[PDB]
Amino acid sequence: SGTLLAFDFGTKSIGVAVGQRITGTARPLPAIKAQDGTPDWNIIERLLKEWQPDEIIVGLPLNMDGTEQPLTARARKFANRIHGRFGVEVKLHDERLSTVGKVDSASAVIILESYFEQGY
Template sequence: MIEKELEKPLKSLMGFDFGSKSIGIATGQMITMTAQPLLAIKAQNGIPNWDNLEQLIKEWQPDMLIIGLPLNMDGTEQYITQRAKKFANRLHGRFGVKIALQDERLTTASAKEFIFELGGYKALDKGKIDSVSAALILESWMSQYVIPS
């Protein structure tokens, strides 16, 4: 696992819910093992404004970026899976931050359910759904994290 290869303990994380029109972003802390939705940024055909992402990464200074990996329910890859992997590779190439991919099956459905419970249909804003999905992806990754020995 990638966790065994880390030379220093992780403290802060940034999670991404990749989409072709919108990318949800969340931050997380390993100390509390919790994540908070941050925002969603617009993308054109899966390509974000890289300057905006650079600003966020500089501001939050995450030790690792966790990118949601969209898979079919049977675990097979789909077209968007390859695009999410490409996005992850571009993040690593541009910013030099370690990355990890996390299975994101059902996170959007869970995010919608969570937001609906808090505020009904009016609260189901696309940006909010994407950023909550990013937080769920982060929390899912953290729940599987093994502390290096």
């Protein structure tokens, strides 16, 4: 299909974006609340049945030198649980970021756009 979902892990909120390869674009969906990084999996399940993504992307936050940040490990755990519970291919995409509703998903849109621009 060329349809993809991206998630921006957070402990209180997880951003969501849906993207289309055919048109090469990404757009935000309403963020998902989390309780210490745990969402209401029914929401994630609904998104997967509704969009049938060819694969899903999860941002792997790192430092500008590529070292791991505090959330890196949680982000990864989150990524494995999606894959584990749903079987869809999940891909971690290095989120190299620096210290410088759908609006709460802005970071998920950037993660997905970057993933397309880098040729993945």
